Amino acid sequence: LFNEIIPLGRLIHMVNQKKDRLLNEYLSPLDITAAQFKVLCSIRCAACITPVELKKVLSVDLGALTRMLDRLVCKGWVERLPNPNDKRGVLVKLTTGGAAICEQCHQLVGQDLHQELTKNLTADEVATLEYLLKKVLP
Amino acid sequence: LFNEIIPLGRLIHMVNQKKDRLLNEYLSPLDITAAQFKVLCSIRCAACITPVELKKVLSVDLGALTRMLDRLVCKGWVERLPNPNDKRGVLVKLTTGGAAICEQCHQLVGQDLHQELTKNLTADEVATLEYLLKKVLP
Ligand SMILES: O=C(O)c1ccccc1O
Numbered sequence: 685l686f687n688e689i690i691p692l693g694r695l696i697h698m699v700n701q702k703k704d705r706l707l708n709e710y711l712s713p714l715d716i717t718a719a720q721f722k723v724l725c726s727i728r729c730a731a732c733i734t735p736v737e738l739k740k741v742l743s744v745d746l747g748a749l750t751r752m753l754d755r756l757v758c759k760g761w762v763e764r765l766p767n768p769n770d771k772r773g774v775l776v777k778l779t780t781g782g783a784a785i786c787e788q789c790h791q792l793v794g795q796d797l798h799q800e801l802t803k804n805l806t807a808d809e810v811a812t813l814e815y816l817l818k819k820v821l822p
Numbered sequence: 823l824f825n826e827i828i829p830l831g832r833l834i835h836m837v838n839q840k841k842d843r844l845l846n847e848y849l850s851p852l853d854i855t856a857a858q859f860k861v862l863c864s865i866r867c868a869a870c871i872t873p874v875e876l877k878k879v880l881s882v883d884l885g886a887l888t889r890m891l892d893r894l895v896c897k898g899w900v901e902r903l904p905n906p907n908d909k910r911g912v913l914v915k916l917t918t919g920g921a922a923i924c925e926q927c928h929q930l931v932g933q934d935l936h937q938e939l940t941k942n943l944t945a946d947e948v949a950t951l952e953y954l955l956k957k958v959l960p
Pocket residue numbers: 735736746749750753774
């Protein structure tokens with residue numbers, strides 16, 4: 685692995701891959717799926733967002749989103765309200781319980797990933813990788 | 823950005839995000855979508871793969887995959903064959919043309935991303951980021 689020249693793009697891929705695999709593994713015992721968790725974190729950040737805008741942010745099939753949003757409402761984690769800047773549409777936001785669920789999860793997974801991801805590079809120091817990864821964003 | 827302590831997980835996220843955004847931007851002028859490209863690269867690597875296995879590898883709604891696979895067949899990029907280790911199922915593989923399309927794209931995007939992603943950290947040296955990113959995989 686350290687004897688092969690793998691281009692950054694693929695490495696970022698492989699690592700994101702791993703990151704998600706760990707995520708699924710951490711949510712495996714909980715009554716919620718990785719996808720449901722992602723949809724909650726995305727609606728949260730935006731406070732209120734349209735399903736279509738949410739559809740664009742997640743890069744997902746609209747059909748699967750609709751069923752997804754309905755499942756989330758059934759779980760009492762999401763609710764729909766009229767869109768002010770419109771009238772033919774709605775917005776979806778988290779219900780109080782949904783918000784709590786999203787925070788219980790966000791905290792736990794965030795505490796297991798950091799460890800697992802940093803489990804062996806710590807010496808080289810997460811701060812350095814983080815530093816260089818920032819130089820890629822602007 | 824360099825004055826805020828953003829945890830690795832989110833940074834990897836934000837960066838993968840960026841990476842995909844560039845991808846969409848590079849394929850924007852071509853008659854193909856990022857999702858179609860991903861499905862082609864995934865089938866390729868595996869040589870031959872079942873739709874369900876492909877469904878698992880991509881983490882996508884089966885419904886959107888089915889329509890996706892049909893669209894790809896219409897474009898002449900993918901073809902279905904009987905699954906040997908089964909008999910009630912099929913495998914999907916790329917057609918010769920599909921293979922070429924996947925290579926024309928893989929080469930171009932791979933040549934624009936490397937540059938764009940490395941556009942400003944080059945000094946710090948992509949090799950270092952790549953090194954540390956590897957220490958995260960095992
Ligand atoms: O679930 C909805 O209310 C919805 C509304 C508009 C477009 C896509 C959707 O899933």
